[PDB]
Amino acid sequence: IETRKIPIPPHRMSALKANPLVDHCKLQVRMNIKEKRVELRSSKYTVSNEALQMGADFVSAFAMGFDIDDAIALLRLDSLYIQSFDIKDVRQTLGPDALSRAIGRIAGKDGKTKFAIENATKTRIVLAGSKVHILGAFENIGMARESIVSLVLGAQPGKVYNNLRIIASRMKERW
RNA sequence: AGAGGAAGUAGGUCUCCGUAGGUGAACCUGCGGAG
């Protein structure tokens, strides 16, 4: 018997108030957004540490901000990973004009560039200021990470998109 | 002004918060902020 309790920030309170994991993978659940905690208890129906860690990874993904569609995709696919990249990681300058300028470069107007990168390398990323969150198979996450760090190092977005497209094709290929 | 003669050139997304207005619980818009 094992338990795991995860915190949520108060961003996602309503969507966590929206409703099932006990039916998904037989792991009993308690929640309280006043203490900001989610408790996952292992009853007798529970079998695997893999399933318990999977429920933990799912609830942490929904806390860190993905929607329920890609969240249950993370629940069902065992070959799907998440990664958290802070924007203060490896950095070209000591100037604190980083934040607005670089995340404007990454997003683009009406999310066009984030959307094009997502549809290109098949990942799903979310963006909240400092922290960016990438979701996908780990090699595609590597592709999106290299694209984003090139964007924050300051290459032109058209050039980055072109190079990303040809690398996306050559990795999609088998032989 | 005249018919001939001769010549040459051809780049802030998402969430949340505080606002002000809108049709009010909610919801939308705009702005200011934190992730």
Side-chain angles (χ1 to χ4, degrees), chain A residues 39-77 79-171:
Chain A
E39 325 173 314
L40 308 170
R41 193 177 282 111
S42 67
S43 155
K44 290 177 70 68
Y45 293 157
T46 67
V47 51
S48 291
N49 187 22
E50 309 298 279
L52 193 43
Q53 177 59 34
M54 186 46 66
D57 281 12
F58 163 75
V59 59
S60 44
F62 186 70
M64 69 193 290
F66 299 97
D67 54 286
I68 194 175
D69 313 60
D70 303 326
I72 57 185
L74 191 40
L75 254 174
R76 67 184 82 174
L77 269 74
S79 162
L80 210 60
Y81 297 143
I82 40 163
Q83 258 161 25
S84 279
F85 202 63
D86 51 283
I87 206 60
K88 312 303 191 319
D89 215 350
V90 66
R91 177 69 193 179
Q92 86 277 12
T93 176
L94 82 171
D97 203 32
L99 263 68
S100 162
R101 184 72 44 84
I103 81 167
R105 272 208 221 86
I106 294 173
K109 53 194 303 163
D110 310 66
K112 47 177 195 83
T113 321
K114 168 213 281 182
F115 194 50
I117 274 174
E118 273 185 323
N119 287 335
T121 180
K122 297 293 183 183
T123 77
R124 188 81 168 85
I125 77 162
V126 305
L127 197 40
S130 302
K131 279 210 173 279
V132 68
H133 298 163
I134 303 99
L135 195 151
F138 82 110
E139 203 51 37
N140 292 107
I141 293 178
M143 297 163 114
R145 159 179 304 176
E146 291 152 325
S147 71
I148 283 179
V149 301
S150 160
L151 272 177
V152 73
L153 283 197
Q156 295 257 25
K159 167 70 190 65
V160 177
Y161 191 58
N162 194 16
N163 177 42
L164 182 67
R165 272 182 74 255
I166 56 174
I167 296 179
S169 158
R170 264 141 191 84
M171 196 174 291

